[PDB]
Write a protein that binds this ligand. Structure first.
Ligand SMILES: NC(=O)c1ccc[n+]([C@@H]2O[C@H](COP(=O)([O-])OP(=O)(O)OC[C@H]3O[C@@H](n4cnc5c(N)ncnc54)[C@H](O)[C@@H]3O)[C@@H](O)[C@H]2O)c1
Ligand SMILES: NC(=O)c1ccc[n+]([C@@H]2O[C@H](COP(=O)([O-])OP(=O)(O)OC[C@H]3O[C@@H](n4cnc5c(N)ncnc54)[C@H](O)[C@@H]3O)[C@@H](O)[C@H]2O)c1
Ligand SMILES: NC(=O)c1ccc[n+]([C@@H]2O[C@H](COP(=O)([O-])OP(=O)(O)OC[C@H]3O[C@@H](n4cnc5c(N)ncnc54)[C@H](O)[C@@H]3O)[C@@H](O)[C@H]2O)c1
Ligand SMILES: NC(=O)c1ccc[n+]([C@@H]2O[C@H](COP(=O)([O-])OP(=O)(O)OC[C@H]3O[C@@H](n4cnc5c(N)ncnc54)[C@H](O)[C@@H]3O)[C@@H](O)[C@H]2O)c1
Lengths: 21, 339, 338, 338, 338, 68
């Protein structure tokens, strides 16, 4: 996926942030 | 003999809470924060460090900046802004320990890019990915091995649930356990409906009850190994900006009653868990637990038990400050057992 | 031939109810003919039309004069007396009173409507003392036409009780714990203010607020063999409508998450249709605004450990869902009026 | 020979006032010895200590028994009577009543405290009818010891009036419009519920709610020259405390933003010190919680068009800053008993 | 024939625009055939359907696969590339690009769409540099087919500019101050985080946040007569949608509130129909969700002083109203194509 | 309660008896003696006025309870 290949390079974008809380 | 030189990678809610925890506790510390790396600039991060919507205005000392450093009472913290830790100047800065607080390097391979940059150890302020030793202060940190170059301090919810689960398991023997954390929202949720790898975290945070999958369910089984695979649960993000409550329902082996459950945790809070668990019979609400330094505050009024063996306990925690207090504790602990 | 209805208390439930009946009026045995409330018809017609949660009412024109609210040419007489004994139910021929004030939920309190001339009272809340409680879908068929005062339980009880009945009949529930993470409601103070409950005193939109709930024990009222086996609490959170129940149970019969979901799913299509809705969608509370089901199971959240500790999570529009059940319970009563 | 004080209405203002005096107790000519309120002492002791906005009270321990709130060993006797006429002011030797219920803002209403034994009454809101209104820093030196019922006006008046006085004396205000973007207050409704104000009736944490502001008329009370020349409104918004007024003035002596800011800055360091604070920082409302000034001018937002159209923006903690002035006015009265 | 449209940036505006188009599709010269966004079609079909503000999409069924979003059998090809030059505009026969990422607002930035193959670009925000700005109902009839990159100004601009035009032509505007009390937007921070604007860096749902407004400059671009004569600011408040602008104008022809209202009202029923709506109801911000008008004048708040200081207050759904205008601007461009 | 509504009817009767017969009256003395008598019985589980107001005004903001 393009949005899956984008969250690989930039996990620190507010489109990918995952904080296991 | 000298002090451990610390850098903060990611000057966000945790990175800045941790900084203010250290700044307050600095009189007793084997640490010295000498560097920050963040996407933003020194002047902007100085502003945020001082003017916090949640902690109020910092007043223990003056806080300024120039193009290179932030200053907290004349104490200089050098500031660099590169998104790849590989490129960070940890070698020239003599960085002994890195607080990985960006949420972006929870894996050993990403977390050890700080080691390629010259760092000697790395404390991830989040559950680690893959086999990374995970520690909870007051439950498990005493098993820290000075040879660990990469550690995980856990999640906020894990630091709340784990001390309580340890007392309850030893008192009554936990067999299975469910958990639900009614959790303040956090920076990884979107302010208005926007793209996200978590379709629930994609939705407007201050507008919704948002169920997401927490790993505190998994983590607790790490720091208490005999409960691996015996606990599970979820999270419900709700429209408060800080302070969470965790609701734990457990099937125990030794019969008990709410009076006895409370007394156990109270006794723990005063002796073997002093400073980690706090015991409250007061009828308070979330706002009242802002800035609380405990990992868990048991809401003794909410304990209930059915049939002697199904136990319900509810604990508060300041997901930002409390978790930052433990991060600091864990870092000091590593500074004491440094090799 | 047609059961004349009056609403006592034109708050969030009185008005939701009113707007439920207005949309279900085509096939209805109820004619709302009068309103008692602390306020006036002009003020209450305005609220009726402009709802911050439900939006502008679109079906019919809402108007009012000195003594009447009019909805689509249908007149509703209004009075304003806080003692239901003074109310003109005899004059108005009120057959059914909807008791939506929250104040008259004991037998003696509610009975004042009967003294004023009403025949039956449907309390929109848990009853005090020995008032028969009903949840449409769980026990509303044991309703006895000779009952003059009834309780439609709480919103939470109407969400948990149907899920408890399905799970209990599938695997036999031995004990159960619930937490409802609940939108705030009118009994909480907007800012820290005097109250008999020290937690309800605190600012509702700023805080997570624990409060005692009885919906857990109240489930044992309608599923009488789980009496004394359920308990729970409430967490009030800063949302204005829609809540979610978290139910953790130990069951006799070993199962897994998938079976739990399939059971509830099959009930939602057959025995509990219209009452339970089954969802595998990854939604949030906003998406459930205006849902007509008492319970919406969030299938992605179901968990089971060791075969016997079951966890389920169910959404509900505490305002609008509960009101559909209030109307359902009334429509049923009008069916078996005796 | 202190001035014995009782608080009528232990609400947001009443408890901020109490905490204000507790911090300033050492230098005060006032002694708070009595409280009348809807609630009992234990509940009021709890709310005094645990405050969602101000946080937990730090300075001294707060206990309570059936009879009194205790502030670090200082006793405040408590009663619960909603009719001020029955209050034990005579027996308690009450000199000054801080009228903070909101529902005794007429002269006859507030005078019930005098029938009960008090000597003077300070209304923590605008008065209805001929009641001399005051703003510390604007006209409180025109207070006359013969005045036994006084108003300290509203929170917006206390923010706006000092900046208007400064502007007027420097450039000559000919006309002025105001809009306070205002944190909601206990007067509004958590969820849509009846209210004499059809907009304040609507769920406060959900809405921008346009409404009236006392400053519209009271600024002209304390600055008589400008009576009839000012007007405005309020937009209540979903924040629980801290507010900001936006004021646009038609002025006579043409100026520019630099000149306006220097004038207000100059006042804030001299004649208006402690009332106006001058700010060049890029802050937001949370940063002004607990700020003792009546007005914090946000200098960065000052703009002037055509030399004659002046726009200024001033923050204020409507709970804590206003209470600081209630204390100031009461101390002033304490200094001028006769 | 049909003007083939692509959406660049499937955000709040991009998805409101889609839902606008879908409701007006049966009468439209445009055909939305492509989407570019950082996210995938499945995520974006989920967002298009489930919307915290607009509710679940009713009109048509929405679905997706690896390649496209389907809105009732209508297939919208999706790509995910963040450099417009690499976008398949030429291969998709795209004519008009609705640029809604907020990052390509300069001419050279937006121009990348032209290199990729598109023929015109409509920026859903103010432009950077010489980019013609249009507001529908104020100056859009001046648009020229030769212009291929256009700005539709901000939401606040689209609300204030129709009213200024009326006020100006009726009374002659010499100067004007504006303050929009404004719901927060994606541009702000959920919790305190770094941001170019030190106040939009601060937790949006916690604070009143003063910031800039595009209407301060944009109104003067669409009403050239008034360039340099308007100014103002934005206060961002904790509501997710719907905003209100406060406009205080010094005018030349002396007037009174009744006359100000009667001029805007008649305009609203003639030359500004659909653009300005005149309201006398006592409503709050929730009630204007989904209004199709650019400005709703709140006549109850109109006030005037000394004949020359006029205060008007206008609501607008900054998401839905603004998107309706973007569609209008687009249809107009497809009408006058070249 | 009972003793309260008698202490107000005891000083109302003692102030009327005192004014009629004078201040030095033996009747006024017994009137205040009888009031002191019912105040010594009145003083010789601590329900609050708050709790009695919520019994009389159950629908007040200070008293609502919705069992949800
Ligand atoms: N806040 C909580 O509730 C909480 C509790 C326990 C644990 N945690 C953990 O703490 C971590 C941080 O969370 P937070 O709430 O501080 O989030 P945050 O968004 O406030 O912090 C992120 C900060 O890191 C910076 N950053 C992002 N990418 C970067 C990069 N590539 N290089 C350098 N800097 C970068 C950003 O500028 C931002 O300031 C998360 O992993 C979370 O799981 C959070
Ligand atoms: N919406 C929910 O959250 C919810 C869900 C399920 C059940 N309930 C129950 O329904 C009941 C109503 O709750 P609500 O949130 O609609 O309350 P509310 O406070 O919004 O409305 C109460 C109304 O009753 C009127 N009223 C009060 N005292 C009166 C009197 N003596 N005579 C006439 N009218 C009077 C008030 O004017 C007000 O309009 C409560 O008892 C609650 O327990 C509420
Ligand atoms: N809240 C503000 O920001 C602010 C600012 C300036 C002025 N004021 C004014 O101050 C006054 C107090 O308002 P508040 O915000 O504290 O509201 P509040 O509801 O928090 O306080 C009112 C208190 O008075 C009590 N009360 C009500 N009626 C009573 C009676 N008959 N007898 C005894 N006690 C009674 C209530 O129990 C409550 O504790 C209002 O008139 C308001 O206009 C408020
Ligand atoms: N929302 C309002 O109130 C409003 C009103 C009028 C005008 N506007 C303007 O409209 C614009 C859109 O704002 P919004 O509210 O939709 O924000 P948003 O964050 O909801 O939308 C931004 C979208 O664009 C995408 N995007 C960002 N950068 C990209 C890139 N380089 N390539 C491809 N896609 C990219 C993001 O994934 C996101 O989906 C803003 O510039 C704003 O100034 C907004």
């Amino acid at each position: 996926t393009s949005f899956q290949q984008y969250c690989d390079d930039n996990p620190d974008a507010a489109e990918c942030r995952i904080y296991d809380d | 003999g000298s002090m451990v030189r610390v850098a903060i990678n990611g000057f966000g809610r945790i990175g800045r809470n941790f900084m203010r925890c250290w700044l307050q506790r600095k009189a007793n510390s084997k640490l010295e924060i000498v560097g920050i790396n963040d996407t933003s600039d020194p002047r902007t991060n100085a502003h945020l460090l001082k003017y916090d919507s949640m902690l109020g205005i910092f007043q223990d000392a003056e806080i300024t900046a120039d193009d290179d450093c932030i200053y907290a009472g004349g104490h200089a913290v050098k500031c660099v802004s590169d998104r790849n830790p590989e490129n960070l100047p940890w070698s020239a800065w003599g960085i002994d320990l890195v607080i990985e607080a960006t949420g972006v390097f929870t894996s050993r391979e990403g977390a050890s890019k700080h080691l390629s940059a010259g760092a000697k150890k790395v404390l991830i302020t989040a559950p680690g990915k893959g086999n990374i030793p995970t520690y909870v202060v007051g439950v498990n940190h005493h098993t820290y091995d000075p040879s660990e170059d990469i550690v995980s301090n856990a999640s906020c919810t894990t630091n709340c649930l784990a001390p309580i689960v340890k007392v309850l398991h030893e008192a009554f023997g936990i067999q299975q356990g469910m958990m639900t954390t009614t959790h303040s929202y956090t920076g990884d949720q979107r302010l208005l409906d926007a793209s996200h790898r978590d379709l629930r975290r994609a939705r407007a945070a201050a507008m919704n009850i948002v169920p997401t999958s927490t790993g505190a369910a998994k983590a607790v089984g790490l720091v208490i190994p005999e409960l691996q695979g015996k606990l599970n649960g979820i999270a419900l993000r709700v429209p408060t900006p800080n302070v969470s409550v965790v609701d734990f329902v457990a099937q125990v082996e030794k019969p008990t009653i709410a009076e006895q459950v409370n007394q156990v945790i109270k006794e723990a809070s005063e002796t073997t868990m002093k400073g980690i668990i706090h015991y409250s019979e007061l009828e308070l609400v979330s706002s009242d637990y802002r800035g609380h330094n405990a990992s868990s505050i048991l809401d003794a009024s909410l304990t209930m038990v059915l049939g002697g063996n199904l136990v319900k306990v509810v604990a508060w925690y300041d997901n930002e400050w409390g978790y930052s207090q433990r991060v600091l504790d864990l870092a000091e602990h590593m500074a004491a057992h440094w090799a």
